[PDB]
Amino acid sequence: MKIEVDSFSGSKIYPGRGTLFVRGDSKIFRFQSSKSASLFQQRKNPRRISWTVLYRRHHKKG
Amino acid sequence: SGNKFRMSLALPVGAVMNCADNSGARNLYVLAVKGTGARLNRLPAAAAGDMVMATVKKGKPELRKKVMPAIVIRQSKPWRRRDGVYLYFEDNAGVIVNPKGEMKGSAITGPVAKECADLWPRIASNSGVVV
Amino acid sequence: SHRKYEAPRHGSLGFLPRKRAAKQRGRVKSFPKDVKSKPVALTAFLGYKAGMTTIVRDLDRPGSKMHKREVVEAATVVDTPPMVVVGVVGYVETPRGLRSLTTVWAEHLSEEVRRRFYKNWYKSKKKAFTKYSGKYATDAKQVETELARIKKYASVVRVLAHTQIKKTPLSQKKAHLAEIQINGGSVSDKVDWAKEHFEKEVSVDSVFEQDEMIDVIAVTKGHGFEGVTHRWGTKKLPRKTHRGLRKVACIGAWHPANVNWTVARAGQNGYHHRTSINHKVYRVGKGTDEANGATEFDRTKKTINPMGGFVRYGNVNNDFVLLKGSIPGVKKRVVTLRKSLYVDTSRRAVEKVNLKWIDTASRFGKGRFQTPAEKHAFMGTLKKDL
RNA sequence: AUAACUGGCUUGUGGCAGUCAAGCGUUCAUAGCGACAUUGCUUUUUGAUUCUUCGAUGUCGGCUCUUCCUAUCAUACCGAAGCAGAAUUCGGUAAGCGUUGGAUUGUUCACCCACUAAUAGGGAACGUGAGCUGGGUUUAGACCGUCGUGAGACAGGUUAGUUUUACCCUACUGAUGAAUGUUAUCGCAAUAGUAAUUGAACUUAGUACGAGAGGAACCGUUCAUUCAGAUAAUUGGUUUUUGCGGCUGUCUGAUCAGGCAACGCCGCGAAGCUACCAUCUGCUGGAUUAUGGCUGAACGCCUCUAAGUCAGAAUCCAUGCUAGAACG
RNA sequence: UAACGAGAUUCCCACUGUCCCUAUCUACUAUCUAGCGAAACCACAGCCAAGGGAACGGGCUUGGCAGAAUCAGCGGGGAAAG
RNA sequence: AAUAGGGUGAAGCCAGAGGAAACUCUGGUGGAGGCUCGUAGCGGUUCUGACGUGCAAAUCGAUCGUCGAAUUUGGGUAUAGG
Numbered sequence A: 001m002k003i004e005v006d007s008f009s010g011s012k013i014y015p016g017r018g019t020l021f022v023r024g025d026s027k028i029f030r031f032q033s034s035k036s037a038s039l040f041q042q043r044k045n046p047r048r049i050s051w052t053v054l055y056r057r058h059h060k061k062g
Numbered sequence B: 001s002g003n004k005f006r007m008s009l010a011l012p013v014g015a016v017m018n019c020a021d022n023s024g025a026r027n028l029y030v031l032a033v034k035g036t037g038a039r040l041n042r043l044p045a046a047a048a049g050d051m052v053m054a055t056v057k058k059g060k061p062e063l064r065k066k067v068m069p070a071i072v073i074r075q076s077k078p079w080r081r082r083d084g085v086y087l088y089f090e091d092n093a094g095v096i097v098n099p100k101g102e103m104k105g106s107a108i109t110g111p112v113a114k115e116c117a118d119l120w121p122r123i124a125s126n127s128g129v130v131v
Numbered sequence C: 001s002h003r004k005y006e007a008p009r010h011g012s013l014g015f016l017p018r019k020r021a022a023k024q025r026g027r028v029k030s031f032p033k034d035v036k037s038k039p040v041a042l043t044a045f046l047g048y049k050a051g052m053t054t055i056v057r058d059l060d061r062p063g064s065k066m067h068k069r070e071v072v073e074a075a076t077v078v079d080t081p082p083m084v085v086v087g088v089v090g091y092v093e094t095p096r097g098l099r100s101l102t103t104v105w106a107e108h109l110s111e112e113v114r115r116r117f118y119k120n121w122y123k124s125k126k127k128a129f130t131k132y133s134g135k136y137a138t139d140a141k142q143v144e145t146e147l148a149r150i151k152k153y154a155s156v157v158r159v160l161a162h163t164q165i166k167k168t169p170l171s172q173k174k175a176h177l178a179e180i181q182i183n184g185g186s187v188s189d190k191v192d193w194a195k196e197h198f199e200k201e202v203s204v205d206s207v208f209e210q211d212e213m214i215d216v217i218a219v220t221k222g223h224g225f226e227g228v229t230h231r232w233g234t235k236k237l238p239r240k241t242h243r244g245l246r247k248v249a250c251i252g253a254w255h256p257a258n259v260n261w262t263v264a265r266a267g268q269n270g271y272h273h274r275t276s277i278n279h280k281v282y283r284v285g286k287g288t289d290e291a292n293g294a295t296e297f298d299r300t301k302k303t304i305n306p307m308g309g310f311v312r313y314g315n316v317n318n319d320f321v322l323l324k325g326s327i328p329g330v331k332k333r334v335v336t337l338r339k340s341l342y343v344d345t346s347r348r349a350v351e352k353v354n355l356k357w358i359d360t361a362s363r364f365g366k367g368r369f370q371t372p373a374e375k376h377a378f379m380g381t382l383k384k385d386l
Numbered sequence D: 001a002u003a004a005c006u007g008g009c010u011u012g013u014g015g016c017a018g019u020c021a022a023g024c025g026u027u028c029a030u031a032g033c034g035a036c037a038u039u040g041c042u043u044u045u046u047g048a049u050u051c052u053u054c055g056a057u058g059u060c061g062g063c064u065c066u067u068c069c070u071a072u073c074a075u076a077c078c079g080a081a082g083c084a085g086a087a088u089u090c091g092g093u094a095a096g097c098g099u100u101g102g103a104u105u106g107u108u109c110a111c112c113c114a115c116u117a118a119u120a121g122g123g124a125a126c127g128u129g130a131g132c133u134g135g136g137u138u139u140a141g142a143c144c145g146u147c148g149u150g151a152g153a154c155a156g157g158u159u160a161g162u163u164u165u166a167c168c169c170u171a172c173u174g175a176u177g178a179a180u181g182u183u184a185u186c187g188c189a190a191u192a193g194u195a196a197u198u199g200a201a202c203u204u205a206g207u208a209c210g211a212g213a214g215g216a217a218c219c220g221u222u223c224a225u226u227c228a229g230a231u232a233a234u235u236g237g238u239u240u241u242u243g244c245g246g247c248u249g250u251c252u253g254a255u256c257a258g259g260c261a262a263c264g265c266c267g268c269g270a271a272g273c274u275a276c277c278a279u280c281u282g283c284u285g286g287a288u289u290a291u292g293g294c295u296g297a298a299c300g301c302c303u304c305u306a307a308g309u310c311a312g313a314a315u316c317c318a319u320g321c322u323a324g325a326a327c328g
Numbered sequence E: 001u002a003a004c005g006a007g008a009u010u011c012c013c014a015c016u017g018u019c020c021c022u023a024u025c026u027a028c029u030a031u032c033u034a035g036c037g038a039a040a041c042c043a044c045a046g047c048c049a050a051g052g053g054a055a056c057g058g059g060c061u062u063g064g065c066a067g068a069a070u071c072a073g074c075g076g077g078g079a080a081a082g
Numbered sequence F: 001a002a003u004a005g006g007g008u009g010a011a012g013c014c015a016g017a018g019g020a021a022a023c024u025c026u027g028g029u030g031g032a033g034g035c036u037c038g039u040a041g042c043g044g045u046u047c048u049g050a051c052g053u054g055c056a057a058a059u060c061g062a063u064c065g066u067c068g069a070a071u072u073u074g075g076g077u078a079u080a081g082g
Ligand SMILES: O[C@H](c1cc(C(F)(F)F)nc2c(C(F)(F)F)cccc12)[C@@H]1CCCCN1
Pocket: D139, D162
């Protein structure tokens, strides 16, 4: 077993957790839960979502 | 010639999927599924990797108005793999084949499910990205 | 006239009546048949359903498309502290069936098992087994006489054992007392084994090994009074039907001028006694081990408990049995684990299980960490951390 | 006293099954058929009658659901062939188990498309309307065609047309419960029910068989269909956690914090419940039917049968599973 | 025959629990309690199988059987009621 | 005696452009109609919804037709059983 990374929020994905999304252009997205999955289909920007890893590295926090 | 595990059915009879090969069809309307037994009131339904009897609702006139076999290559209904992974594609798509499983077209646009590529070698040959 | 079209019947006629179980403790209807040449051993064990978890495992099934490849599987954790042996019963073969001949008890019974015999323990003088405890006065020949009677006349010997429910997080203080048949050896051998185990603890590792297929006896989840649509899975009537649609439309022909026992009717759903067979033991954990959830590939020193404890159970601090799949009952239910009644040589039954990884993320939500240390490493310092 | 339903007698007619054996079948009555005749059965057709009901038994069809019959479409085991193989046809024990999704029609019936192991036929007041629906028929409105001087007729077409009551008894499904000295714990098991089902791929094997064309099967392996019993790891659904956030209108002088919008609306949303929309599990012994045999007379031979006896079906009885007799 | 139509009918796009195939949630009932308190209906009543019988019995004949008092549901029967 | 608020934009009128003329074109203005969307009102399509010993011997809910005239309505008055 290997640990994947959530494409939206960057949280750890353990075996069986979350979903795999294959976009029409053959790109693969991994979501740890339906929370980040819903924000992704709602087109939210993880750089503008305050709890994601992308937001925190962009704002240089921790 | 293969034994794929059960998958969540995505395409009941009457469903219209995308046609992902260059055969000239743009729609594929499911009217039957190969291997569907008997159950009162239950619609036959197909998953990725299933052979289907379909018509071309939209496409070239010589492809239209005929019954032809087709194989579902991707589905938008999420399904669980035996390794625990739930995955889904952006759309439902299929390709026109023979009764033997040999494609009519020569290329496939978009990804192809690994269940279908593992089960139909010709579609694997004509397929690009296989997920 | 005949049905216009055929359909299978809704539900099974072999599980009638769909009534509540007479007792909450599932009872072993049948024990494994005794073979004299085998050693003397217990044939069943009582445990408590803690919760469900997830594992990762490499499949060893040649010819499968998942052979030598990782599979993710649901597993059940059963909290099983050792049971205490307190008695022994002899059964006699009669032309009317088995008959209990005599019951011999141990001298000392713990308070948790003596509460079993009371409805209002706090209001009692707690007199249970006091004269019997006096029966052991300085020669115990009454006890020896009863044991000799069992050796002389009994054909089936069963031990009486109770769980140590004080080692579980349950607020219940009553122990669960059950008869567990002894198999192996002669009748005299069985009686000697029971006597030498009076007031002794027996662990799970002396009854079940890993990779065994075992049965689970339990009372299922109760749902109360239920309509036919969900009780029996009948077809819902059309939307425009007067007086409602979650019904069976025709409950009988004109003749027999009675309602048949085979027609689906509303009634009590769930809380039934079920015996479910062929559950594989992936792990017989040890309570003293601080790495219960650790495997040979995941060396994280880690117990079987998820983060925050099992939801609506607590922590499993005892020995446990990890079963494949789901077993009947709810959380905290007492479950009877029985050895298999037949010899299964299929590859699924004889496969040797080696676990890759055991899930210990929180079951109280979309848990994403396996350990508080991992959580701290991922998130860094928080405000509450000074 | 008398028609239009059901039911009853009857069985012409409908349906099904025999006996004879002129012929067909390269030869050859009887592998499969079978004229001219003739004997029956059935009540799933339609007649005949008018025995019951006119101080009313709700009269089509469909939906839903249970069960039964066997005159067996499939599945188990077998006998026969004008059975080389594959396929097919005839037949036996067999109703244990299944028998479908749709276009058109109110339809029963029909007819196509398609899947399937198969898409068998019937009964239960032509099952089933205080179960539904109301498309049809068969009240009253209206149009047409033919008929009538007319009012009007049509078993012709068309459109719109209120489908009432259970709280009683019984029966079914569940739930308590007096008394069998009291109370508590653990049990036994009479009896009743019962459950699993079918397919595909790989191997055998391009093998047996066959000139070739074609082309199997047993043991085994992995999966799947229909069904059943659970379960909530995971994923999905659900949201009065009105839990957190957001938004509009208005009100509390502003802010903070709030009220109302007959849960104001929106995103996420734990827990609980739940989905072949998720996962798990679904046992092995004996006795037999058809059939094929052993020994063996009758009948100095022969003979599976007469006495005795062997194997043997999805059958039966157990094992197992559910209930536990509230007067075991 | 343009326009108009709560008129009848066929097809197409959008849409959806109409359906595959069901699941979950809210308020009011139902439920239990205090108070209040009707009606339809009623020969006598109320367990089955076969027989015969006004040719489909709750009662008769022959069998199966049969154990107080009951609660919620239910719509097979009372050829239920009107 | 009664009938929110919008849409459309008829005659008539003003100005400009083109043309030999007969005439044509454009922008405003104006406010017609048994016109139109839609309240009160009047009606009663569908759910063949609720209820169907009802709240009611015709009601309740949503949905719907129409809503400036052949409109709705009070009072007075006339017509009386072949
Ligand atoms: O002819 C009238 C009538 C008949 C019928 C019918 F034939 F359909 F059953 N239905 C009627 C209806 C009905 F309810 F719409 F059916 C109403 C009024 C009179 C009807 C009779 C006259 C005697 C009293 C009862 N109604």
